[PDB]
Amino acid sequence: LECHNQQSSQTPTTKTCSGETNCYKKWWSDHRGTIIERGCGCPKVKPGVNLNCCTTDRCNN
């Protein structure tokens, strides 16, 4: 499984997961706007964070 792992609006990058069967994208806003974190797995998040856990290559851009 290949998942995006770049932050926010950075040029996209991916990593090849080593066991995981989800990718994730998590996002919320601060005083500057939207922050995005991306990687392998499907983590628990703090309430009020937006989360996508998806199951296909590069699904979390």
Short mmCIF file of all heavy atoms in Angstrom, two decimals:
data_model
loop_
_atom_site.label_atom_id
_atom_site.label_comp_id
_atom_site.label_asym_id
_atom_site.label_seq_id
_atom_site.Cartn_x
_atom_site.Cartn_y
_atom_site.Cartn_z
N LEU A 1 0.89 -1.20 0.00
CA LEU A 1 0.00 0.00 0.00
C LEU A 1 0.90 1.22 0.00
O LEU A 1 1.80 1.27 0.80
CB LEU A 1 -0.90 0.05 1.20
CG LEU A 1 -1.88 1.20 1.25
CD1 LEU A 1 -2.85 1.16 0.09
CD2 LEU A 1 -2.66 1.20 2.56
N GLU A 2 0.63 2.11 -0.90
CA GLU A 2 1.34 3.37 -1.07
C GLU A 2 0.45 4.50 -0.55
O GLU A 2 -0.70 4.56 -0.94
CB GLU A 2 1.70 3.60 -2.52
CG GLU A 2 2.40 4.89 -2.81
CD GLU A 2 2.63 5.17 -4.29
OE1 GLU A 2 2.20 4.40 -5.15
OE2 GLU A 2 3.24 6.23 -4.60
N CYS A 3 1.00 5.34 0.34
CA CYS A 3 0.20 6.41 0.92
C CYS A 3 0.95 7.74 0.78
O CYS A 3 2.17 7.81 0.95
CB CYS A 3 -0.04 6.15 2.41
SG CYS A 3 -1.02 4.67 2.73
N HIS A 4 0.20 8.80 0.52
CA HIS A 4 0.81 10.12 0.62
C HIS A 4 1.24 10.38 2.07
O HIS A 4 0.66 9.90 3.04
CB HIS A 4 -0.19 11.21 0.19
CG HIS A 4 -0.35 11.27 -1.28
ND1 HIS A 4 0.58 11.88 -2.06
CD2 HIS A 4 -1.25 10.72 -2.16
CE1 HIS A 4 0.23 11.73 -3.35
NE2 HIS A 4 -0.90 11.04 -3.45
N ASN A 5 2.31 11.22 2.16
CA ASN A 5 2.84 11.53 3.47
C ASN A 5 3.32 12.97 3.56
O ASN A 5 3.82 13.36 4.61
CB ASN A 5 3.95 10.56 3.90
CG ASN A 5 5.17 10.58 2.99
OD1 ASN A 5 5.07 10.84 1.80
ND2 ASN A 5 6.31 10.22 3.54
N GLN A 6 3.14 13.79 2.53
CA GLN A 6 3.51 15.21 2.63
C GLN A 6 2.55 15.94 3.52
O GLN A 6 1.37 15.54 3.70
CB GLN A 6 3.62 15.89 1.28
CG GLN A 6 2.30 16.39 0.67
CD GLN A 6 1.42 15.29 0.08
OE1 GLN A 6 1.77 14.12 0.03
NE2 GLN A 6 0.26 15.73 -0.40
N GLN A 7 3.02 17.09 4.06
CA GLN A 7 2.23 17.92 4.93
C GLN A 7 1.52 19.03 4.16
O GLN A 7 2.08 19.55 3.18
CB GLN A 7 3.11 18.61 5.97
CG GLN A 7 3.77 17.59 6.93
CD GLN A 7 4.58 18.41 7.92
OE1 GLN A 7 3.98 18.92 8.89
NE2 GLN A 7 5.86 18.49 7.65
N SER A 8 0.34 19.36 4.63
CA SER A 8 -0.39 20.54 4.12
C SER A 8 -0.31 20.66 2.62
O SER A 8 -0.73 19.72 1.93
CB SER A 8 -0.03 21.79 4.95
OG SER A 8 -0.27 21.48 6.31
N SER A 9 0.14 21.80 2.09
CA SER A 9 0.15 22.07 0.68
C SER A 9 1.50 21.81 0.02
O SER A 9 1.72 22.26 -1.08
CB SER A 9 -0.24 23.54 0.43
OG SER A 9 -1.62 23.69 0.73
N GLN A 10 2.36 21.06 0.65
CA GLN A 10 3.65 20.72 0.08
C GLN A 10 3.46 19.92 -1.20
O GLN A 10 2.46 19.23 -1.42
CB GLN A 10 4.44 19.85 1.03
CG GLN A 10 4.89 20.61 2.24
CD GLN A 10 5.70 19.67 3.09
OE1 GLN A 10 5.46 18.44 3.35
NE2 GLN A 10 6.76 20.27 3.53
N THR A 11 4.50 19.95 -2.00
CA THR A 11 4.54 19.05 -3.16
C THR A 11 4.23 17.63 -2.72
O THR A 11 4.82 17.15 -1.73
CB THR A 11 5.97 19.11 -3.77
OG1 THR A 11 6.21 20.48 -4.13
CG2 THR A 11 6.06 18.20 -4.99
N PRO A 12 3.36 16.94 -3.39
CA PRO A 12 3.03 15.58 -2.94
C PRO A 12 4.23 14.65 -2.90
O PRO A 12 5.10 14.69 -3.79
CB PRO A 12 1.99 15.10 -3.98
CG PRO A 12 1.30 16.38 -4.37
CD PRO A 12 2.45 17.38 -4.49
N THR A 13 4.26 13.80 -1.89
CA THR A 13 5.19 12.70 -1.79
C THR A 13 4.39 11.47 -1.34
O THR A 13 3.27 11.59 -0.77
CB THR A 13 6.34 12.95 -0.81
OG1 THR A 13 5.86 13.12 0.54
CG2 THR A 13 7.09 14.20 -1.18
N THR A 14 4.96 10.30 -1.53
CA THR A 14 4.39 9.09 -0.96
C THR A 14 5.47 8.23 -0.28
O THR A 14 6.65 8.42 -0.53
CB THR A 14 3.64 8.23 -2.01
OG1 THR A 14 4.58 7.78 -2.97
CG2 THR A 14 2.50 8.98 -2.65
N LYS A 15 4.96 7.34 0.55
CA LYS A 15 5.77 6.30 1.14
C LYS A 15 5.07 4.97 0.86
O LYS A 15 3.88 4.92 0.56
CB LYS A 15 5.93 6.49 2.67
CG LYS A 15 4.59 6.42 3.42
CD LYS A 15 4.64 6.91 4.86
CE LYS A 15 5.52 6.05 5.73
NZ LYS A 15 5.62 6.61 7.10
N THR A 16 5.85 3.90 0.96
CA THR A 16 5.31 2.54 0.83
C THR A 16 5.15 2.00 2.22
O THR A 16 6.13 1.83 2.95
CB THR A 16 6.27 1.68 -0.03
OG1 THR A 16 6.43 2.26 -1.34
CG2 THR A 16 5.73 0.29 -0.16
N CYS A 17 3.90 1.74 2.62
CA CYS A 17 3.63 1.25 3.95
C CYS A 17 4.28 -0.12 4.14
O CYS A 17 4.59 -0.85 3.19
CB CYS A 17 2.14 1.14 4.17
SG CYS A 17 1.22 2.67 3.86
N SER A 18 4.48 -0.47 5.39
CA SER A 18 5.18 -1.69 5.76
C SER A 18 4.30 -2.52 6.65
O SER A 18 4.67 -2.99 7.71
CB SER A 18 6.54 -1.37 6.40
OG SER A 18 6.41 -0.48 7.47
N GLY A 19 3.09 -2.79 6.17
CA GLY A 19 2.16 -3.59 6.97
C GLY A 19 0.77 -3.02 6.93
O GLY A 19 -0.23 -3.74 6.89
N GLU A 20 0.61 -1.69 6.92
CA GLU A 20 -0.68 -1.04 7.04
C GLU A 20 -1.54 -1.33 5.81
O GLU A 20 -1.09 -1.46 4.71
CB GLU A 20 -0.54 0.47 7.23
CG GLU A 20 0.27 0.86 8.47
CD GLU A 20 1.77 0.94 8.24
OE1 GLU A 20 2.34 0.38 7.33
OE2 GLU A 20 2.48 1.67 9.01
N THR A 21 -2.87 -1.33 6.11
CA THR A 21 -3.88 -1.52 5.06
C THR A 21 -4.84 -0.33 4.97
O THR A 21 -5.86 -0.37 4.26
CB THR A 21 -4.67 -2.84 5.21
OG1 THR A 21 -5.20 -2.85 6.51
CG2 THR A 21 -3.71 -3.98 4.92
N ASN A 22 -4.51 0.79 5.58
CA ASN A 22 -5.13 2.09 5.38
C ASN A 22 -4.05 3.13 5.13
O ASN A 22 -2.93 2.98 5.59
CB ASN A 22 -5.90 2.56 6.60
CG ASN A 22 -7.22 1.84 6.86
OD1 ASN A 22 -7.27 0.89 7.63
ND2 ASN A 22 -8.28 2.28 6.21
N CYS A 23 -4.49 4.18 4.41
CA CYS A 23 -3.82 5.48 4.46
C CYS A 23 -4.70 6.45 5.24
O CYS A 23 -5.92 6.24 5.31
CB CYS A 23 -3.63 6.08 3.07
SG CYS A 23 -2.81 5.06 1.84
N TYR A 24 -4.12 7.54 5.74
CA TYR A 24 -4.91 8.53 6.42
C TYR A 24 -4.53 9.92 5.93
O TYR A 24 -3.40 10.23 5.54
CB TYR A 24 -4.78 8.49 7.96
CG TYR A 24 -3.48 8.97 8.51
CD1 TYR A 24 -3.23 10.30 8.78
CD2 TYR A 24 -2.42 8.09 8.73
CE1 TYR A 24 -2.03 10.73 9.27
CE2 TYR A 24 -1.22 8.51 9.22
CZ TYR A 24 -1.04 9.85 9.50
OH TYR A 24 0.18 10.28 9.98
N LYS A 25 -5.52 10.80 6.07
CA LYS A 25 -5.34 12.27 5.92
C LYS A 25 -6.12 12.87 7.07
O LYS A 25 -7.29 12.55 7.24
CB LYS A 25 -5.89 12.72 4.56
CG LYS A 25 -5.79 14.18 4.28
CD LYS A 25 -6.42 14.30 2.86
CE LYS A 25 -6.36 15.75 2.41
NZ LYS A 25 -7.02 16.03 1.12
N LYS A 26 -5.47 13.72 7.85
CA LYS A 26 -6.06 14.38 9.01
C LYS A 26 -5.89 15.87 8.84
O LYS A 26 -4.81 16.34 8.44
CB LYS A 26 -5.86 13.74 10.34
CG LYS A 26 -4.40 13.94 10.68
CD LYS A 26 -4.12 13.22 11.99
CE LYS A 26 -2.72 13.47 12.49
NZ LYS A 26 -2.36 12.71 13.70
N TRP A 27 -6.93 16.65 9.17
CA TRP A 27 -6.79 18.11 8.98
C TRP A 27 -7.67 18.87 9.93
O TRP A 27 -8.72 18.42 10.40
CB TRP A 27 -7.06 18.50 7.53
CG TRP A 27 -8.41 18.29 6.90
CD1 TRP A 27 -9.35 19.24 6.66
CD2 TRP A 27 -8.98 17.04 6.41
NE1 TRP A 27 -10.45 18.70 6.05
CE2 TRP A 27 -10.24 17.36 5.88
CE3 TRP A 27 -8.54 15.74 6.34
CZ2 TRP A 27 -11.08 16.40 5.30
CZ3 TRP A 27 -9.36 14.80 5.78
CH2 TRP A 27 -10.63 15.12 5.26
N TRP A 28 -7.23 20.10 10.22
CA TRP A 28 -7.95 21.06 11.07
C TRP A 28 -7.31 22.41 10.76
O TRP A 28 -6.36 22.52 10.01
CB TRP A 28 -7.85 20.72 12.55
CG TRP A 28 -6.50 20.92 13.14
CD1 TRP A 28 -6.09 21.98 13.88
CD2 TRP A 28 -5.37 20.06 13.06
NE1 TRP A 28 -4.81 21.86 14.26
CE2 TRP A 28 -4.31 20.68 13.78
CE3 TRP A 28 -5.12 18.83 12.44
CZ2 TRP A 28 -3.03 20.17 13.93
CZ3 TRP A 28 -3.84 18.28 12.58
CH2 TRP A 28 -2.85 18.95 13.30
N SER A 29 -7.87 23.49 11.31
CA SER A 29 -7.36 24.82 11.07
C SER A 29 -6.83 25.51 12.30
O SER A 29 -7.35 25.34 13.41
CB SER A 29 -8.44 25.68 10.46
OG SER A 29 -8.76 25.16 9.17
N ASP A 30 -5.82 26.34 12.11
CA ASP A 30 -5.34 27.29 13.10
C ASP A 30 -5.40 28.69 12.55
O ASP A 30 -6.13 28.91 11.58
CB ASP A 30 -3.98 26.92 13.60
CG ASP A 30 -2.84 27.17 12.66
OD1 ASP A 30 -3.11 27.60 11.48
OD2 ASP A 30 -1.67 26.96 13.10
N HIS A 31 -4.70 29.62 13.19
CA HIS A 31 -4.85 31.02 12.76
C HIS A 31 -4.38 31.26 11.33
O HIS A 31 -4.76 32.30 10.77
CB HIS A 31 -4.12 31.96 13.74
CG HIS A 31 -2.66 32.10 13.56
ND1 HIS A 31 -1.70 31.29 14.12
CD2 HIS A 31 -1.95 33.04 12.88
CE1 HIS A 31 -0.51 31.73 13.75
NE2 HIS A 31 -0.60 32.82 12.99
N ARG A 32 -3.58 30.39 10.74
CA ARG A 32 -3.09 30.55 9.39
C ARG A 32 -3.92 29.77 8.37
O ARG A 32 -3.76 30.15 7.22
CB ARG A 32 -1.62 30.15 9.30
CG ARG A 32 -0.71 31.12 10.05
CD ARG A 32 0.75 30.78 9.83
NE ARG A 32 1.15 29.63 10.61
CZ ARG A 32 2.13 28.80 10.22
NH1 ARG A 32 2.77 28.92 9.06
NH2 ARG A 32 2.43 27.84 11.08
N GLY A 33 -4.76 28.88 8.79
CA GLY A 33 -5.56 28.13 7.81
C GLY A 33 -5.39 26.63 8.09
O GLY A 33 -5.14 26.22 9.21
N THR A 34 -5.63 25.85 7.03
CA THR A 34 -5.73 24.42 7.18
C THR A 34 -4.36 23.77 7.27
O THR A 34 -3.49 24.01 6.46
CB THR A 34 -6.45 23.85 5.95
OG1 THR A 34 -7.69 24.54 5.73
CG2 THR A 34 -6.80 22.35 6.15
N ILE A 35 -4.22 22.86 8.24
CA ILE A 35 -3.06 22.00 8.46
C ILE A 35 -3.46 20.58 8.09
O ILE A 35 -4.53 20.15 8.48
CB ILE A 35 -2.69 21.99 9.95
CG1 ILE A 35 -2.40 23.37 10.50
CG2 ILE A 35 -1.43 21.16 10.15
CD1 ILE A 35 -2.62 23.47 11.99
N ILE A 36 -2.62 19.89 7.34
CA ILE A 36 -2.91 18.51 6.92
C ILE A 36 -1.73 17.61 7.25
O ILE A 36 -0.58 17.96 6.93
CB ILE A 36 -3.25 18.44 5.43
CG1 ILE A 36 -4.26 19.51 5.00
CG2 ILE A 36 -3.76 17.02 5.08
CD1 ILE A 36 -4.34 19.60 3.48
N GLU A 37 -2.02 16.46 7.82
CA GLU A 37 -1.06 15.42 8.07
C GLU A 37 -1.50 14.16 7.29
O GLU A 37 -2.71 13.87 7.23
CB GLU A 37 -0.94 15.12 9.55
CG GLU A 37 -0.47 16.23 10.49
CD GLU A 37 -0.59 15.97 11.97
OE1 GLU A 37 -1.31 14.98 12.30
OE2 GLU A 37 0.04 16.75 12.72
N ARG A 38 -0.55 13.43 6.73
CA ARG A 38 -0.88 12.30 5.86
C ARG A 38 0.09 11.16 6.18
O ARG A 38 1.30 11.38 6.39
CB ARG A 38 -0.72 12.67 4.40
CG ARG A 38 -1.68 13.73 3.91
CD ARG A 38 -1.39 14.05 2.48
NE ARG A 38 -2.24 15.09 1.87
CZ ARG A 38 -2.00 16.41 1.93
NH1 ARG A 38 -0.99 16.88 2.66
NH2 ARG A 38 -2.79 17.22 1.28
N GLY A 39 -0.39 9.90 6.13
CA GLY A 39 0.52 8.78 6.26
C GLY A 39 -0.19 7.46 6.14
O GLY A 39 -1.28 7.34 5.56
N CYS A 40 0.49 6.42 6.65
CA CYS A 40 -0.02 5.06 6.70
C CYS A 40 -0.79 4.79 7.99
O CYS A 40 -0.42 5.29 9.06
CB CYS A 40 1.15 4.07 6.58
SG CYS A 40 2.07 4.09 5.02
N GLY A 41 -1.81 3.98 7.90
CA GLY A 41 -2.64 3.56 9.05
C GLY A 41 -3.91 4.38 9.13
O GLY A 41 -4.25 5.14 8.22
N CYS A 42 -4.60 4.20 10.24
CA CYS A 42 -5.83 4.93 10.52
C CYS A 42 -5.84 5.21 12.02
O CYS A 42 -6.37 4.43 12.81
CB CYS A 42 -7.08 4.14 10.11
SG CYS A 42 -8.61 5.07 10.40
N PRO A 43 -5.27 6.34 12.41
CA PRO A 43 -5.11 6.66 13.82
C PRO A 43 -6.38 7.18 14.47
O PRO A 43 -7.25 7.78 13.80
CB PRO A 43 -4.00 7.76 13.79
CG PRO A 43 -4.31 8.48 12.51
CD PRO A 43 -4.69 7.42 11.55
N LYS A 44 -6.43 7.05 15.78
CA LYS A 44 -7.39 7.81 16.57
C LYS A 44 -7.03 9.28 16.44
O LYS A 44 -5.84 9.60 16.45
CB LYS A 44 -7.30 7.33 18.06
CG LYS A 44 -8.53 7.63 18.90
CD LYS A 44 -9.77 6.83 18.52
CE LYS A 44 -10.93 7.52 19.22
NZ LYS A 44 -12.28 7.08 18.95
N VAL A 45 -7.98 10.21 16.41
CA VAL A 45 -7.72 11.63 16.40
C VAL A 45 -8.44 12.30 17.55
O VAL A 45 -9.47 11.87 18.07
CB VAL A 45 -8.14 12.28 15.05
CG1 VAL A 45 -7.33 11.65 13.91
CG2 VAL A 45 -9.65 12.18 14.78
N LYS A 46 -7.91 13.44 17.94
CA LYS A 46 -8.55 14.36 18.88
C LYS A 46 -9.92 14.77 18.33
O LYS A 46 -10.04 15.07 17.14
CB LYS A 46 -7.69 15.57 19.09
CG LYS A 46 -8.13 16.53 20.18
CD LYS A 46 -7.87 16.01 21.58
CE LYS A 46 -8.09 17.07 22.62
NZ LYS A 46 -9.52 17.29 22.87
N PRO A 47 -10.98 14.84 19.12
CA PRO A 47 -12.26 15.31 18.63
C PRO A 47 -12.14 16.66 17.92
O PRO A 47 -11.41 17.55 18.34
CB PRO A 47 -13.15 15.40 19.87
CG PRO A 47 -12.58 14.30 20.71
CD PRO A 47 -11.08 14.43 20.52
N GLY A 48 -12.87 16.78 16.81
CA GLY A 48 -12.88 17.99 16.04
C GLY A 48 -11.86 18.04 14.95
O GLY A 48 -11.81 19.00 14.16
N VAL A 49 -11.00 17.02 14.86
CA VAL A 49 -10.13 16.84 13.71
C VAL A 49 -10.92 16.14 12.62
O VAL A 49 -11.74 15.26 12.88
CB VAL A 49 -8.93 15.98 14.17
CG1 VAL A 49 -8.05 15.56 12.99
CG2 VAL A 49 -8.09 16.80 15.15
N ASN A 50 -10.68 16.56 11.36
CA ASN A 50 -11.24 15.86 10.22
C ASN A 50 -10.30 14.72 9.83
O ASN A 50 -9.09 14.88 9.84
CB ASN A 50 -11.32 16.82 9.03
CG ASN A 50 -12.20 18.00 9.40
OD1 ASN A 50 -13.43 17.91 9.25
ND2 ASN A 50 -11.59 19.06 9.83
N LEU A 51 -10.87 13.57 9.47
CA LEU A 51 -10.07 12.38 9.19
C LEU A 51 -10.67 11.67 8.01
O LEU A 51 -11.88 11.45 7.92
CB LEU A 51 -10.05 11.44 10.41
CG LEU A 51 -9.31 10.12 10.26
CD1 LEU A 51 -7.83 10.33 10.08
CD2 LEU A 51 -9.63 9.27 11.49
N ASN A 52 -9.80 11.22 7.09
CA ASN A 52 -10.14 10.24 6.05
C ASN A 52 -9.18 9.07 6.26
O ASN A 52 -7.96 9.29 6.20
CB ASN A 52 -9.95 10.81 4.65
CG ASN A 52 -10.07 9.90 3.46
OD1 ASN A 52 -10.33 8.74 3.58
ND2 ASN A 52 -9.83 10.27 2.22
N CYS A 53 -9.70 7.87 6.47
CA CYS A 53 -8.91 6.66 6.35
C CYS A 53 -9.44 5.93 5.12
O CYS A 53 -10.63 5.64 5.00
CB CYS A 53 -9.03 5.75 7.56
SG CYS A 53 -8.46 6.59 9.04
N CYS A 54 -8.51 5.66 4.20
CA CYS A 54 -8.89 5.07 2.90
C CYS A 54 -8.00 3.82 2.70
O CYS A 54 -7.18 3.51 3.55
CB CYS A 54 -8.85 6.14 1.82
SG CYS A 54 -7.25 6.97 1.69
N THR A 55 -8.24 3.07 1.63
CA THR A 55 -7.78 1.71 1.54
C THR A 55 -7.10 1.39 0.22
O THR A 55 -6.86 0.20 -0.03
CB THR A 55 -8.96 0.76 1.80
OG1 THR A 55 -10.00 1.05 0.85
CG2 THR A 55 -9.51 0.88 3.21
N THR A 56 -6.82 2.37 -0.61
CA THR A 56 -6.24 2.15 -1.91
C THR A 56 -5.02 3.06 -2.14
O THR A 56 -4.89 4.11 -1.49
CB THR A 56 -7.30 2.35 -3.00
OG1 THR A 56 -7.77 3.71 -2.90
CG2 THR A 56 -8.46 1.37 -2.87
N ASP A 57 -4.16 2.66 -3.06
CA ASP A 57 -2.92 3.38 -3.24
C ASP A 57 -3.18 4.87 -3.52
O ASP A 57 -3.99 5.24 -4.38
CB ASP A 57 -2.13 2.81 -4.42
CG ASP A 57 -1.42 1.47 -4.13
OD1 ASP A 57 -1.17 1.15 -2.97
OD2 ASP A 57 -1.04 0.81 -5.12
N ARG A 58 -2.45 5.71 -2.78
CA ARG A 58 -2.44 7.15 -3.05
C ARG A 58 -3.82 7.75 -2.84
O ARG A 58 -4.10 8.82 -3.41
CB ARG A 58 -1.88 7.49 -4.43
CG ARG A 58 -0.48 6.93 -4.68
CD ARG A 58 0.03 7.20 -6.09
NE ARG A 58 -0.84 6.55 -7.08
CZ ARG A 58 -0.80 5.27 -7.44
NH1 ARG A 58 0.13 4.42 -6.99
NH2 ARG A 58 -1.70 4.81 -8.29
N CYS A 59 -4.62 7.15 -1.96
CA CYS A 59 -6.00 7.60 -1.78
C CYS A 59 -6.15 8.83 -0.88
O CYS A 59 -7.24 9.40 -0.81
CB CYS A 59 -6.84 6.46 -1.26
SG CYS A 59 -6.27 5.78 0.34
N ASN A 60 -5.09 9.20 -0.19
CA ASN A 60 -5.11 10.21 0.86
C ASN A 60 -4.40 11.53 0.48
O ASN A 60 -3.90 12.22 1.34
CB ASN A 60 -4.48 9.66 2.15
CG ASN A 60 -3.00 9.34 1.95
OD1 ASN A 60 -2.58 8.97 0.84
ND2 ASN A 60 -2.24 9.51 3.02
N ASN A 61 -4.40 11.88 -0.80
CA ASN A 61 -3.85 13.19 -1.20
C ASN A 61 -4.80 14.28 -0.74
O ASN A 61 -6.04 14.13 -0.85
CB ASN A 61 -3.58 13.24 -2.69
CG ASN A 61 -2.58 14.31 -3.10
OD1 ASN A 61 -1.78 14.82 -2.29
ND2 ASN A 61 -2.58 14.63 -4.38
#
